[PDB]
Amino acid sequence: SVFSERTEESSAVQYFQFYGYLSQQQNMMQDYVRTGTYQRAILQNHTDFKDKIVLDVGCGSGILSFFAAQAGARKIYAVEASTMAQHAEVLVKSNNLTDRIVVIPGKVEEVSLPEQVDIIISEPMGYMLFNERMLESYLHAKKYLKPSGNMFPTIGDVHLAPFTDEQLYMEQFTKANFWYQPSFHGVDLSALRGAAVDEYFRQPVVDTFDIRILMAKSVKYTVNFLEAKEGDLHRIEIPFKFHMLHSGLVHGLAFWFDVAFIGSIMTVWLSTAPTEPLTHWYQVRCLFQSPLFAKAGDTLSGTCLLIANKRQSYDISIVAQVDQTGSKSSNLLDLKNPFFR
Amino acid sequence: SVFSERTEESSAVQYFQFYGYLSQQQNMMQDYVRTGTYQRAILQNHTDFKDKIVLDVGCGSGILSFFAAQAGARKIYAVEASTMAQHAEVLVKSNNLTDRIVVIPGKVEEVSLPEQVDIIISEPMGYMLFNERMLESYLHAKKYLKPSGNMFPTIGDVHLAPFTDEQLYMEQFTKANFWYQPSFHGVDLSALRGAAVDEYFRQPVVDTFDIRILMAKSVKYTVNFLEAKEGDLHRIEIPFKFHMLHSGLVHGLAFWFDVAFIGSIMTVWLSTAPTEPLTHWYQVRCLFQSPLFAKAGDTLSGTCLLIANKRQSYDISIVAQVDQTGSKSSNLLDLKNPFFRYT
Amino acid sequence: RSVFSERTEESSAVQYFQFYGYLSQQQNMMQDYVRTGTYQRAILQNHTDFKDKIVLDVGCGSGILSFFAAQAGARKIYAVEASTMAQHAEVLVKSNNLTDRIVVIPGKVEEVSLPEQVDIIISEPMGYMLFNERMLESYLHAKKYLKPSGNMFPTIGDVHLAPFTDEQLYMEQFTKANFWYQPSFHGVDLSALRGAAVDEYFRQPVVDTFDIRILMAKSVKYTVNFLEAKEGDLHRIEIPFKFHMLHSGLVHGLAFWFDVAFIGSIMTVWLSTAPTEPLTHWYQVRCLFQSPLFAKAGDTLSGTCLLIANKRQSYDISIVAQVDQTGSKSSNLLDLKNPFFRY
Amino acid sequence: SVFSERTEESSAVQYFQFYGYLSQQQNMMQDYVRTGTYQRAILQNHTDFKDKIVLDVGCGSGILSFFAAQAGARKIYAVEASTMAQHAEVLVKSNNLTDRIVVIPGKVEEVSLPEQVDIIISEPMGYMLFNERMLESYLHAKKYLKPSGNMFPTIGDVHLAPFTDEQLYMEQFTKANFWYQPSFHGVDLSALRGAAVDEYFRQPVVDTFDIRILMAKSVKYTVNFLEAKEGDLHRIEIPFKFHMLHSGLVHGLAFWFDVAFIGSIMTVWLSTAPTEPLTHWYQVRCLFQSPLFAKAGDTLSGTCLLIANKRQSYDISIVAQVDQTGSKSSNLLDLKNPFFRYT
Ligand SMILES: Nc1ncnc2c1ncn2[C@@H]1O[C@H](CSCC[C@H](N)C(=O)O)[C@@H](O)[C@H]1O
Ligand SMILES: Nc1ncnc2c1ncn2[C@@H]1O[C@H](CSCC[C@H](N)C(=O)O)[C@@H](O)[C@H]1O
Ligand SMILES: Nc1ncnc2c1ncn2[C@@H]1O[C@H](CSCC[C@H](N)C(=O)O)[C@@H](O)[C@H]1O
Ligand SMILES: Nc1ncnc2c1ncn2[C@@H]1O[C@H](CSCC[C@H](N)C(=O)O)[C@@H](O)[C@H]1O
């Protein structure tokens, strides 16, 4: 199947075991911004659901399917590959919605649906939008979408911006500096200092921060889920040109994302921006091993290259240069292994 | 191999990926109690190493092998199955010990070692001593040990003691009761509350605690690594009879462990007890489904049965009863997926 | 031919005596009230050691100590000064009507001819970490003019050293060096010099003061007796130390200060630059390890601080320190002539 | 050599020791205005470098030579007399430019270059442009310049303007009046007050200031590096006639400088004016011993005479008079020892 061909079994085992825990489903459900904004997107656009056929990709507890049922959907196919599928069925029955929500256990790349659907709903967003590679499952599911059918969410915007944060940089460098020791219990570790810096700086930093650390207006990269093919997400090239608003050290790039539910009645946005209330996605920062100095008015140009890997994540390459000085940084990050700060 | 036969590949992949991180090796190395005590055990028993042949099972960074070298070992075979083996090789070279330390990449169950050794060293201990099932690799390695040989550590003691912790017990329900509401954004979640409770109780709790929650002297189960066969660790039956020192509600069993290095000069102990400075192993607590009331002077008797599984861990079966009242409780827990509660 | 020129590069000496030829630098020392007031107290409280005696003031600067000796009743004071300040001292002697008692002799004390032997030598020859500037050798050299029965003011000098923890200072210095880790400074890869940069920054002793709570063990004391010592004794100063750690943590280096004692006939007067005492223009001095050492309370930190005199009127400092229980060792080289004034 | 003949060894030793520190090179490199403007001048005039032969006089770290290489230079001879030369060589190798950059250790007055060059680059500017006398080394290097050749920078403009700053002027006496006391620890210091005043006024003041303290449009003195000979810088006579824009007391002259890189594509300016972002050169102020009252519309005429000395600096003589009143003041300053006032 498309899923198995792009995924190491070890990764998939761990992945679906994770989502098989009620505590993890609870953790997502209790993100009120997320869950509440999905409910608002679906109910405020009830006409996009009324008497329609719906596909919920990765239904987990079933919560989004219940929202579709509230909005008047005729039939909702709720596809879920983890053992959580059986718990969703328990809820469908206990909520007397067996006539409207049909749980389909399995991977959306592998199951058979009885009919085409009018609209697909999902919450496939990971850290930095793309982690977990579930957007590919979401896009894959369009094989079941009627022509002119809709996608909720409809588009995704990734935002990137340069930041200054000496404390974070030193925090990571300090951890790496353990391997600088020439006599740890009598052992010279220093030959590994380079490998250690590489490893620590390969970790994207997941937390939030004060917006005043951003040194330029963000650059936007948009994925249109109505138009995109899953293949489009195997190699994501994001060029950027920042006009520096402040002088200082650029320690790296900060990432966040918005998704929009573009319904018939209104467009509803779910944002993970640092200007907005915190979600369980927080924000993500990719550190440079060495910061770049820029003055206000300079331009910081480069590319963020995301290569999907078989562990359901991405290999991140960031290259950035201050155009006026040729000061350049290149970095490699492993999105699967973030530092939760 | 013996390893592959007892381990699901997925588990092994994740396991050795974990130890391939310098950050995880560092985490262990910076546990000063652990690393310092190993060093002390090896150096203070230098006559057990001087001019000897040594096997380091799962050498990681190589640190214990460097200690064996500090103690004068003639030759050290350092076996390591994760990619960390290449970093250990770098350190052996940079510390000018290529004549003394040989890194062997691979599983100790699978590699070829050329000769028998005088002593095996290893740090194979997991949570509750047995988690990760690496003690079996350690014992397996005795195929390379001379009959007169030694094991460092030489013995391992797992300690169990009953505890009272009302807040810990109540917490499970507080979390599970998320599901006990009729209209979460319009949805009745209550049908899943029992399943949520069950899930939380299946998780051993990793953190530390005030020793004043302990209600009796611990019961000790000793593995003698010189005498034990790896097969001895597939099923570990730990009967216990606690002589209650305090009256109250027993909410479960607390676990910790000690290991001893029994050398020619002295015995050195490494302890993860809650009476000792904290280590990266913390301690482990397993809840009963229902607390048991016990009076000071009562006896709390039963069994903790640890059944090895192919996820490099154990299923923990606990049965306990107050002998004087006949009140009984049990739990079955999954050690592979503990709840890390520590703050 | 002179002892001074034989041990001193001309460049260093020119700069050195130019520095002290400035009235502003003399003013700076004079306005150190602890220093100047304590010298005055030492001399006046021991006036019977000066009354009707012959005095040599080694490096008189403005003449201030010679004026104190005159206040204490000295019969004749030879005030030797090699910088152009000698001419300003002469002006003050005349304007204070002390021409019959204070005789300024311009030149280096190693090179001038004095008319008679003296009863007592006074000087302020102490530099940073006591020994910087190597003026203590000039002070000791001057003993060729001292009567067998003679005294030295100050009489002894105590150097104190203690381990300290200060993550912020360490990080502050490393941050400066990290400039040289850049792979693309305006397009230029600087990183090949990162090692040289770290060495250079960490070679700088840090002159400032600090909270005594950063100290992790009781100080070790090294005493120089100026009555007994010979010049040659200061070419190589070896200070062994063994610290009993009172606190657990990272040792980022050794902190240094010094006391001198004026051992007079009436009383002993102490001038201290300790961090427990009011600040002086000597502040205190800290020598960083390039890599900190972890120690727990009860551990011992042992090693040697070796000072090798150099021709730039200072010392090459080698500090080697080891945590005895673990063999964790740090070795560092500092250039005392060029400290980082952080205050 | 020309260098040794004009420089006291003592000065030269200290001077090249200073530039041998990576931290000092770093200090200059991190002056973004300076470094960035050099890079811009070189890169925006790439046709002056593309496939050309270049001489870098005093390359330090090598940074300007790397800029010349970025601009496409065929060959760059990078001359450096301090031990920094060894580090520059490390950078040339690590940046894979050994085929294009040749580091030549030594003084430019003493080394041999294998061929003539098309363009000379340097950053030889000191305080008030001329301090350090490195401009003479820059001009000396033209012995290697082709008749076709260019100089980057091409011209240097020193600007001078009268300023009012009552607080700066009064500060000198506040400091000097330390000596105006009859009993400093019993000593009458007053006889040295005049010498102290003289000493403070002999120091040019390095810092920055509000442009509103300037009382007239600056007068400019231009050195054309294409045309000037070394000898032209031994005696620099700068006549001035200021037309006062503001009425008030003139406390002295403020100095700054600009350099221009006059390339084939464009002229690029590097300015240290008080109207521009600050550089590590700040600005320099020389006080008059006595301020001069001038009315708006009055003229302040005189001369600033800079006499080179063998300490790689200048003796500054300033004489000024208000033409309408005949009120006159002067000062003699020592540029080698400025007072760094900036905070
Ligand atoms: N290819 C795939 N096919 C089916 N389910 C998948 C899948 N990839 C991920 N999933 C499931 O998708 C869910 C993502 S978490 C979102 C859960 C729920 N829709 C909510 O919004 O609360 C998980 O339960 C995961 O097991
Ligand atoms: N069967 C096996 N064969 C070889 N190495 C193994 C193994 N089981 C576990 N390991 C390795 O054993 C190590 C356990 S962690 C101990 C590391 C190091 N000896 C120290 O004391 O710091 C890990 O690096 C793990 O990869
Ligand atoms: N070898 C030497 N011979 C003579 N003077 C020397 C000397 N070495 C140092 N000096 C002088 O000693 C002085 C040290 S500073 C102390 C000055 C003064 N005695 C006071 O206590 O305030 C300086 O003026 C310095 O020039
Ligand atoms: N006569 C001379 N010959 C060679 N190098 C000299 C010199 N006079 C000064 N220098 C060197 O010139 C440098 C001046 S500082 C400028 C350094 C570098 N070009 C930069 O722009 O960053 C110092 O390193 C100093 O040692």
Side-chain angles (χ1 to χ4, degrees):
Chain A
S1 90
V2 166
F3 180 88
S4 67
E5 287 295 303
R6 67 165 171 86
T7 309
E8 292 177 19
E9 194 178 355
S10 177
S11 180
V13 171
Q14 178 182 321
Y15 181 80
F16 291 115
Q17 277 179 0
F18 178 87
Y19 281 119
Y21 284 100
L22 289 164
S23 60
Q24 291 305 337
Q25 297 292 333
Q26 170 177 350
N27 185 65
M28 293 178 290
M29 294 161 78
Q30 284 194 292
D31 180 337
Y32 179 68
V33 175
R34 186 199 79 109
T35 304
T37 301
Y38 266 83
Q39 191 177 32
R40 188 171 57 97
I42 292 163
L43 296 187
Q44 292 289 353
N45 288 294
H46 59 272
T47 57
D48 292 316
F49 292 88
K50 180 57 175 170
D51 293 322
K52 305 287 188 307
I53 309 300
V54 181
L55 169 58
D56 183 354
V57 180
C59 70
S61 68
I63 186 65
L64 304 187
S65 290
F66 289 110
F67 298 161
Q70 293 166 6
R74 171 172 173 175
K75 196 157 179 188
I76 304 135
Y77 297 102
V79 176
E80 170 61 46
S82 83
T83 54
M84 191 55 47
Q86 288 306 317
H87 293 309
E89 179 55 18
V90 165
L91 290 183
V92 168
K93 287 195 173 186
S94 61
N95 281 265
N96 300 307
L97 283 168
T98 62
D99 56 321
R100 299 187 62 203
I101 303 173
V102 185
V103 177
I104 307 299
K107 300 176 182 64
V108 74
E109 295 86 351
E110 297 176 0
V111 299
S112 290
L113 284 190
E115 58 184 322
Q116 301 297 84
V117 309
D118 299 298
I119 182 164
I120 306 175
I121 69 181
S122 187
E123 194 275 88
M125 298 91 73
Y127 296 132
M128 206 164 154
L129 184 56
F130 298 111
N131 190 45
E132 299 176 44
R133 290 188 71 177
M134 188 177 168
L135 280 175
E136 287 166 66
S137 297
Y138 186 44
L139 294 175
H140 181 90
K142 284 190 296 182
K143 65 184 182 181
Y144 289 118
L145 187 61
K146 295 169 178 186
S148 297
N150 207 359
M151 302 278 280
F152 260 39
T154 321
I155 69 170
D157 292 334
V158 182
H159 287 262
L160 39 155
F163 71 87
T164 188
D165 193 335
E166 60 179 329
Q167 178 191 335
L168 173 63
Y169 178 81
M170 262 171 49
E171 187 174 313
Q172 300 304 84
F173 213 68
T174 298
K175 292 179 191 163
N177 280 351
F178 173 84
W179 296 93
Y180 185 66
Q181 290 174 95
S183 190
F184 176 78
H185 295 257
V187 184
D188 187 348
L189 304 181
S190 67
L192 291 178
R193 62 195 154 70
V197 169
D198 290 346
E199 183 181 298
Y200 277 111
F201 276 83
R202 279 186 329 248
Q203 295 189 267
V205 183
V206 177
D207 69 345
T208 190
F209 51 81
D210 191 305
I211 59 170
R212 285 173 298 195
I213 72 165
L214 299 175
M215 305 178 71
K217 178 175 175 287
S218 68
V219 161
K220 184 187 303 171
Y221 181 85
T222 298
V223 184
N224 186 330
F225 299 133
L226 278 174
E227 299 293 335
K229 309 297 186 178
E230 59 182 314
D232 295 338
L233 301 182
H234 297 173
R235 178 183 177 96
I236 307 165
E237 190 181 340
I238 305 171
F240 57 81
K241 187 168 183 179
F242 295 111
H243 301 270
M244 303 301 294
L245 302 175
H246 302 100
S247 301
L249 295 178
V250 179
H251 286 101
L253 298 182
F255 296 81
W256 62 91
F257 67 89
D258 304 327
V259 298
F261 306 82
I262 305 172
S264 294
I265 298 171
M266 66 179 68
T267 295
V268 172
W269 287 90
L270 172 61
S271 175
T272 62
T275 47
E276 299 289 325
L278 200 57
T279 76
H280 78 283
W281 288 285
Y282 299 84
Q283 290 89 37
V284 179
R285 282 181 288 173
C286 297
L287 289 166
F288 302 150
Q289 291 194 8
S290 179
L292 300 171
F293 181 76
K295 291 193 169 287
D298 285 346
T299 55
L300 181 75
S301 284
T303 306
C304 173
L305 183 63
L306 306 170
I307 308 296
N309 60 47
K310 296 190 187 301
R311 297 165 299 128
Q312 297 174 276
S313 192
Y314 284 81
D315 308 314
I316 302 167
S317 178
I318 293 165
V319 184
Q321 70 173 48
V322 180
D323 296 317
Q324 287 70 25
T325 61
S327 300
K328 178 177 177 177
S329 188
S330 307
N331 316 266
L332 299 171
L333 299 99
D334 178 33
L335 183 55
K336 185 82 294 192
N337 173 236
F339 168 45
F340 306 101
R341 184 169 181 252
Chain B
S1 90
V2 165
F3 182 89
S4 68
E5 287 295 303
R6 67 166 169 86
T7 310
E8 291 178 19
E9 193 178 354
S10 56
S11 180
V13 173
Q14 174 185 82
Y15 182 79
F16 290 115
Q17 278 178 359
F18 179 93
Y19 282 117
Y21 286 101
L22 288 164
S23 62
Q24 293 304 337
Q25 296 292 332
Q26 172 176 351
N27 184 65
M28 296 178 294
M29 295 158 77
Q30 283 194 292
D31 181 335
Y32 180 76
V33 174
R34 186 200 79 108
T35 301
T37 300
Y38 266 84
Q39 188 179 31
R40 187 178 328 128
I42 294 161
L43 294 182
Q44 291 182 338
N45 285 294
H46 55 84
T47 59
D48 289 312
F49 292 87
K50 179 55 176 168
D51 294 321
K52 306 287 186 167
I53 311 300
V54 182
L55 169 58
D56 183 355
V57 178
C59 71
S61 67
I63 187 66
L64 305 186
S65 289
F66 292 113
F67 298 158
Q70 290 167 6
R74 179 172 179 177
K75 188 64 169 289
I76 303 135
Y77 295 98
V79 180
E80 172 60 46
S82 84
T83 54
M84 190 54 47
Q86 289 305 319
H87 293 311
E89 180 57 19
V90 166
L91 290 185
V92 167
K93 289 190 176 184
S94 62
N95 282 266
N96 303 291
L97 282 167
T98 58
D99 56 321
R100 300 264 300 289
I101 302 174
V102 55
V103 178
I104 307 300
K107 302 175 183 65
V108 73
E109 294 87 351
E110 297 175 357
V111 295
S112 290
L113 278 189
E115 60 180 321
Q116 302 299 86
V117 305
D118 298 300
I119 185 162
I120 305 175
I121 65 183
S122 187
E123 197 271 270
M125 298 91 72
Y127 295 135
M128 267 180 65
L129 185 57
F130 299 109
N131 192 44
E132 301 174 43
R133 291 187 69 179
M134 187 176 169
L135 279 173
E136 284 165 62
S137 298
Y138 185 42
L139 294 174
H140 178 92
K142 285 192 297 181
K143 64 184 181 181
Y144 295 119
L145 184 61
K146 294 170 176 187
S148 61
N150 205 0
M151 302 280 279
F152 259 37
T154 318
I155 67 170
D157 292 333
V158 62
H159 288 262
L160 299 71
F163 71 87
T164 185
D165 193 335
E166 188 67 39
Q167 288 166 320
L168 175 63
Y169 185 87
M170 182 173 325
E171 186 173 310
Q172 311 310 315
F173 299 95
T174 304
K175 294 187 295 187
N177 280 350
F178 164 79
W179 298 91
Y180 203 63
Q181 58 180 298
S183 192
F184 176 79
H185 298 257
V187 186
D188 186 347
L189 300 181
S190 65
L192 292 181
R193 189 269 195 167
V197 170
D198 191 273
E199 179 180 294
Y200 286 124
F201 269 81
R202 275 180 54 84
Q203 294 190 280
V205 183
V206 175
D207 68 346
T208 192
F209 48 82
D210 189 305
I211 57 169
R212 288 175 300 194
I213 71 165
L214 300 174
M215 304 179 70
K217 176 176 173 286
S218 69
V219 162
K220 186 178 78 180
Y221 182 92
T222 300
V223 183
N224 184 327
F225 300 133
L226 274 173
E227 300 181 342
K229 304 176 74 69
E230 59 184 314
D232 294 337
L233 301 183
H234 296 171
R235 176 188 176 277
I236 305 165
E237 188 185 341
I238 308 173
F240 56 80
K241 190 167 183 178
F242 296 114
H243 307 272
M244 303 302 293
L245 300 174
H246 301 284
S247 302
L249 298 181
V250 181
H251 288 105
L253 299 184
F255 295 80
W256 63 89
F257 68 88
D258 305 331
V259 297
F261 308 84
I262 304 172
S264 294
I265 297 171
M266 66 182 68
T267 295
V268 173
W269 286 90
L270 169 59
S271 176
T272 63
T275 49
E276 296 288 325
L278 200 57
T279 75
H280 78 284
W281 288 286
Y282 301 84
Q283 290 88 36
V284 179
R285 282 182 288 172
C286 297
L287 293 168
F288 298 142
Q289 157 179 234
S290 294
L292 300 171
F293 171 68
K295 300 188 280 298
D298 285 348
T299 57
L300 180 75
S301 68
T303 64
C304 170
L305 182 63
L306 309 174
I307 308 167
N309 62 46
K310 294 192 185 301
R311 296 155 34 237
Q312 296 173 277
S313 193
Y314 288 82
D315 298 305
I316 301 169
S317 179
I318 296 164
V319 188
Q321 69 174 5
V322 179
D323 297 318
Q324 287 71 25
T325 66
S327 181
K328 183 174 179 176
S329 193
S330 70
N331 197 8
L332 177 81
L333 300 97
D334 177 31
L335 184 54
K336 181 67 178 285
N337 295 285
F339 178 54
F340 192 82
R341 185 172 180 254
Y342 184 72
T343 54
Chain C
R1 184 91 56 91
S2 92
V3 165
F4 183 88
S5 65
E6 288 295 303
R7 68 164 170 86
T8 311
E9 299 291 341
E10 191 182 355
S11 177
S12 182
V14 171
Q15 176 184 229
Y16 181 81
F17 291 116
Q18 279 178 359
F19 176 89
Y20 280 120
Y22 286 104
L23 288 165
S24 62
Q25 294 297 344
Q26 298 293 335
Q27 169 177 350
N28 184 64
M29 294 178 291
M30 295 162 78
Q31 285 193 293
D32 181 338
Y33 179 66
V34 175
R35 185 199 80 108
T36 301
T38 299
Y39 265 84
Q40 190 175 33
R41 192 182 331 129
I43 289 162
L44 296 187
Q45 292 290 355
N46 287 293
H47 60 271
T48 54
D49 290 314
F50 291 86
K51 183 60 174 171
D52 293 322
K53 308 290 261 294
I54 309 300
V55 179
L56 168 59
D57 181 353
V58 179
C60 72
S62 68
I64 188 66
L65 303 186
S66 290
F67 289 108
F68 299 161
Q71 292 163 6
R75 176 169 98 247
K76 204 67 167 205
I77 303 134
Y78 299 101
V80 177
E81 172 63 46
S83 83
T84 55
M85 191 56 48
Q87 284 74 37
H88 293 308
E90 289 167 34
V91 168
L92 287 184
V93 170
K94 287 194 173 186
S95 64
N96 280 265
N97 301 307
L98 282 167
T99 59
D100 58 323
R101 296 181 61 203
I102 302 174
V103 184
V104 173
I105 300 175
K108 301 176 241 284
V109 71
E110 294 84 349
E111 296 176 0
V112 298
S113 193
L114 277 192
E116 58 183 321
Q117 302 300 85
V118 307
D119 298 296
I120 185 162
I121 304 175
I122 68 182
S123 188
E124 198 271 86
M126 298 91 75
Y128 295 134
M129 266 184 66
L130 182 56
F131 299 108
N132 191 45
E133 300 176 44
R134 292 188 70 179
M135 187 176 171
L136 282 175
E137 288 166 66
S138 299
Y139 186 42
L140 296 177
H141 180 93
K143 285 164 62 178
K144 65 183 182 180
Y145 295 116
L146 185 63
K147 292 171 176 187
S149 59
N151 206 359
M152 303 277 279
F153 258 33
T155 320
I156 66 171
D158 292 333
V159 172
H160 288 262
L161 48 157
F164 71 87
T165 186
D166 194 335
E167 186 181 17
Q168 180 192 79
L169 173 62
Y170 179 81
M171 279 329 156
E172 187 176 313
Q173 299 304 87
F174 231 102
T175 296
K176 292 179 191 162
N178 285 8
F179 171 84
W180 296 94
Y181 284 63
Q182 290 177 95
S184 192
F185 177 78
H186 295 257
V188 184
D189 187 348
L190 303 183
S191 68
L193 293 177
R194 59 195 149 69
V198 172
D199 291 347
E200 183 182 296
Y201 278 113
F202 276 80
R203 276 187 327 249
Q204 296 190 101
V206 182
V207 179
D208 68 345
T209 189
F210 52 82
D211 192 307
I212 57 170
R213 287 175 298 194
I214 69 165
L215 300 175
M216 305 178 72
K218 179 175 176 287
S219 69
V220 157
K221 188 177 78 180
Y222 181 86
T223 299
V224 186
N225 184 326
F226 301 134
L227 276 174
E228 299 180 342
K230 285 178 71 72
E231 273 186 273
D233 297 339
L234 299 182
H235 297 175
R236 185 182 184 276
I237 305 165
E238 190 181 341
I239 308 172
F241 57 81
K242 190 168 183 179
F243 293 109
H244 300 269
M245 302 301 294
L246 300 174
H247 300 100
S248 302
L250 294 178
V251 181
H252 288 104
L254 298 183
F256 295 82
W257 61 91
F258 68 88
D259 305 329
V260 299
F262 306 83
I263 303 172
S265 295
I266 299 170
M267 66 182 68
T268 293
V269 174
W270 286 92
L271 169 59
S272 176
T273 61
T276 46
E277 298 289 324
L279 201 57
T280 75
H281 80 284
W282 288 286
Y283 299 86
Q284 290 88 37
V285 180
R286 282 182 287 175
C287 297
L288 291 166
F289 301 149
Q290 291 193 8
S291 179
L293 300 170
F294 181 76
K296 292 200 170 290
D299 287 347
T300 56
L301 180 74
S302 69
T304 307
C305 172
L306 181 61
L307 301 97
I308 310 297
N310 60 45
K311 298 280 281 284
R312 297 164 299 129
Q313 295 171 274
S314 193
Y315 288 82
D316 309 310
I317 295 170
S318 45
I319 295 166
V320 299
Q322 178 195 37
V323 180
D324 298 319
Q325 288 72 26
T326 66
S328 299
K329 178 176 177 176
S330 187
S331 307
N332 316 267
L333 299 173
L334 299 98
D335 178 34
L336 183 54
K337 180 68 179 286
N338 295 286
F340 168 42
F341 306 96
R342 183 170 181 250
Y343 185 72
Chain D
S1 89
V2 167
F3 182 87
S4 68
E5 286 295 304
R6 68 166 169 86
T7 309
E8 290 179 19
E9 296 298 336
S10 56
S11 181
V13 173
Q14 175 185 287
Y15 181 80
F16 291 115
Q17 279 178 359
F18 179 90
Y19 280 117
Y21 285 97
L22 289 164
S23 62
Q24 293 303 336
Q25 296 291 333
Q26 172 176 350
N27 184 65
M28 295 178 293
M29 295 160 79
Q30 283 195 291
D31 181 337
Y32 183 80
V33 174
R34 186 198 80 109
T35 301
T37 301
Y38 267 83
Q39 189 179 31
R40 267 167 46 234
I42 293 161
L43 294 184
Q44 291 182 339
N45 286 294
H46 54 83
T47 60
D48 289 310
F49 291 87
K50 183 60 173 171
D51 205 36
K52 305 287 187 168
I53 312 300
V54 183
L55 167 59
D56 181 354
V57 178
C59 71
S61 67
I63 186 64
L64 304 186
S65 288
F66 291 113
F67 297 158
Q70 292 168 6
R74 173 170 175 174
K75 186 61 56 56
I76 304 135
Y77 297 102
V79 180
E80 172 61 45
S82 83
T83 55
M84 190 56 48
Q86 289 78 21
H87 295 309
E89 179 58 19
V90 165
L91 291 184
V92 170
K93 288 193 174 74
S94 61
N95 282 267
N96 300 308
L97 282 167
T98 56
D99 57 322
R100 296 205 274 153
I101 303 173
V102 177
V103 179
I104 305 174
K107 302 176 184 65
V108 76
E109 294 85 350
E110 297 175 358
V111 300
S112 70
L113 259 63
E115 61 183 322
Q116 301 297 84
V117 309
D118 295 301
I119 183 164
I120 302 175
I121 66 183
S122 187
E123 194 273 89
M125 299 92 73
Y127 294 134
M128 28 193 292
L129 185 56
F130 300 110
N131 190 46
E132 301 177 44
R133 291 187 70 179
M134 188 177 170
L135 280 172
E136 286 164 63
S137 298
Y138 187 42
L139 295 177
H140 180 92
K142 286 188 298 181
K143 65 184 181 181
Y144 295 120
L145 185 63
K146 291 169 175 186
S148 63
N150 207 359
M151 302 280 278
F152 259 33
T154 320
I155 65 170
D157 292 332
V158 59
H159 287 260
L160 35 172
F163 70 87
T164 185
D165 193 332
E166 186 66 38
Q167 286 164 319
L168 173 63
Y169 182 87
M170 277 179 51
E171 186 172 308
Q172 310 312 313
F173 298 91
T174 305
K175 293 188 296 189
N177 279 348
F178 164 77
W179 299 90
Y180 204 62
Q181 60 177 298
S183 193
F184 176 81
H185 298 258
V187 184
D188 186 346
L189 301 180
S190 68
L192 292 178
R193 190 269 196 167
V197 168
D198 189 70
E199 179 181 296
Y200 286 125
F201 271 82
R202 283 184 63 87
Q203 294 189 280
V205 179
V206 176
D207 70 346
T208 192
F209 51 81
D210 192 305
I211 59 169
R212 286 172 299 198
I213 71 165
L214 299 174
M215 304 178 70
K217 180 176 177 287
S218 69
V219 162
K220 184 177 79 180
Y221 181 92
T222 299
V223 183
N224 182 329
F225 300 133
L226 281 172
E227 299 179 341
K229 298 291 188 175
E230 278 185 87
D232 296 337
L233 300 183
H234 298 172
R235 178 188 176 278
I236 304 165
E237 191 186 343
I238 309 170
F240 56 80
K241 193 119 188 172
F242 294 113
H243 308 273
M244 304 302 294
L245 301 174
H246 303 286
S247 303
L249 296 179
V250 180
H251 289 106
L253 299 181
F255 295 79
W256 62 91
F257 67 90
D258 305 327
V259 298
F261 306 84
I262 303 173
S264 294
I265 295 172
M266 67 182 68
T267 293
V268 173
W269 286 90
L270 171 59
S271 177
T272 65
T275 50
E276 299 288 325
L278 204 57
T279 74
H280 80 283
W281 289 287
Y282 300 86
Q283 290 87 37
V284 180
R285 284 181 289 172
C286 296
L287 291 165
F288 297 141
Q289 291 187 5
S290 297
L292 302 171
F293 175 70
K295 298 188 277 70
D298 285 348
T299 55
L300 179 74
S301 67
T303 303
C304 172
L305 183 62
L306 310 171
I307 307 167
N309 61 48
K310 294 193 183 301
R311 297 166 298 128
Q312 294 174 277
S313 194
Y314 286 82
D315 308 314
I316 301 168
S317 177
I318 298 164
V319 305
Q321 69 179 321
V322 182
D323 299 319
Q324 288 71 24
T325 69
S327 181
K328 176 179 176 178
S329 191
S330 68
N331 197 13
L332 300 172
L333 302 97
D334 180 33
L335 184 55
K336 181 68 177 285
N337 293 284
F339 178 56
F340 192 81
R341 186 172 181 254
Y342 185 73
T343 53

